[PDB]
Design a protein around this nucleic acid. Sequence first.
DNA 1: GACCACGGCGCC
DNA 2: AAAAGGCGCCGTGGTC
Length: 539
Amino acid sequence: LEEAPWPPPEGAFVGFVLSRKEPMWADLLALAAARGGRVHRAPEPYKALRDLKEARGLLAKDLSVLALREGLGLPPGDDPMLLAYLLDPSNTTPEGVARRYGGEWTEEAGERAALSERLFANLWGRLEGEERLLWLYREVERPLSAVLAHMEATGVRLDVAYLRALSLEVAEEIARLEAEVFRLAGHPFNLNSRDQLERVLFDELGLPAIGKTEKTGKRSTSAAVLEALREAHPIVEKILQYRELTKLKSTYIDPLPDLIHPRTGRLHTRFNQTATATGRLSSSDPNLQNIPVRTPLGQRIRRAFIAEEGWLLVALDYSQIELRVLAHLSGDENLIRVFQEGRDIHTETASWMFGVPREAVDPLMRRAAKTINFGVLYGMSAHRLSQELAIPYEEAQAFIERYFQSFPKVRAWIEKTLEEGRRRGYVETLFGRRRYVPDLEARVKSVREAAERMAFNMPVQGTAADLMKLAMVKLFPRLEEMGARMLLQVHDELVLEAPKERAEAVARLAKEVMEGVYPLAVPLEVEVGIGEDWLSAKE
DNA sequence: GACCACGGCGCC
DNA sequence: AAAAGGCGCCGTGGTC
Ligand SMILES: NCCCC#Cc1cn([C@H]2C[C@H](O)[C@@H](COP(=O)(O)OP(=O)(O)OP(=O)(O)O)O2)c(=O)[nH]c1=O
Ligand SMILES: [Cl-]
Ligand SMILES: [Mg+2]
Ligand SMILES: [Mg+2]
Ligand SMILES: [Mg+2]
Ligand SMILES: [Mg+2]
Ligand SMILES: [Mg+2]
Ligand SMILES: [Mg+2]
Ligand SMILES: [Mg+2]
Ligand SMILES: [Mg+2]
């Protein structure tokens, strides 16, 4: 392309190079733009940003977040990555997308600008006639990228001092556990090494091996294996506790306080829009979609996520969402009726599991039942089921039989979905998001059946994903108008931050928007909590 | 120093 | 571990 002076005309595609992948932490090393057979290279990248009306091109959101960081209201526009992702969600990297749709991802801004331009042209052409994918792009993905940019640049507050204090207490407990483990082993070793631990458990103490690892076929020391061996030797329970504590310390307690951004004094994640096979978002650098909540220490960590002073967190979470979605997709009367009657399948399963009335079910019981309900729905084996429930194999089988016998049309929907997946080569969500699954026609049964579970899950999980995205796009402008902030999405949950005086009003509005987003054959219900911290917000 | 596969595990 | 699906990050062992 003919080189030309900065700035570019309106509608130009941008290319840019960052010192690191995370836009909140990156230095903008170079910036260029391409349009109408011209390439414009910016002599001063930061200053040049103010000349742009929007960020249009590959990874548009990243440039937008950096702009927002610098106090510039630069929104993201067209991004070929989003087009490619909609065509085929295995399109997840600019490297792959460039190669596939007409170019090469290099480390030069001008070349990236030019690449963005021609990729958009090509990919736009491919989405012609694809009216549903086009709808998703214009009505969901493109606007959502703006929403996500603001969320990333906003960040969330973290009680750093608290976490620092927590680290020392956890360190002392870890020392206590490991010392005990070493005594029981008769000698010290690296307890963080599963290879060393395998030798101690199965060769030195005698313990019977139960399972093997996938790629290298070592004797597994996973929690599932250790659970089965809890009553075989005292060292086992000690290892399980050590694992729990060290996992939380190494992954959350220690890293997170070090990631507070110096300017904002908050913690900033990345919400990746083209990262999953089903249409879910992912979160990275750091991942804020897997903050602990199940165990006591886990809850203490979640409490470190706090509202700004004078503000409150609002947490909203769709109730039994994939089950409701399944009701709609399958059209099963029995399942639809369950939700019309305001029933809770997680609580009911829980009451059965622990053998107590539905009123006796506590949160941890219900949560346990959640794993069981979705586990069974998406093809869990009776053997695994029996093992995790410590009930005979025969009982496990029976629960799985009643589960489906309760809801006749679910299996019917599955069969139809798989048949159609085999025919077209892909499956799709309610809104037409696609996932290609060639292995539905695999000649190896284990490979084929794995593919089948992926395939019939995707329309359900993906539809739920689409609904949340649509809800975020509708909700965002309403929140702006109320002076509230959208902070995090956790799959079927949103976390907002609102001034205390308005927090209740914001909660009510957000709930109604989420419930009214796209009516199904069953009501959508959203549970909402308000609190000074994320854990308190979830009640 | 950086990458990698792996086993493992946090969340949904 | 086992016929749940979907993610990203940890330390280890290893290479470069
Ligand atoms: N398993 C740990 C407990 C939390 C969980 C979960 C899981 C959630 N999911 C999917 C199905 C579920 O509808 C969706 C959102 O999860 P979540 O909000 O925790 O469950 P759901 O909304 O069904 O129940 P509630 O929100 O508690 O009413 O994510 C699974 O497929 N497997 C799961 O294990
Ligand atoms: Cl889980
Ligand atoms: Mg790719
Ligand atoms: Mg939910
Ligand atoms: Mg609205
Ligand atoms: Mg949830
Ligand atoms: Mg419909
Ligand atoms: Mg892995
Ligand atoms: Mg699982
Ligand atoms: Mg290892």
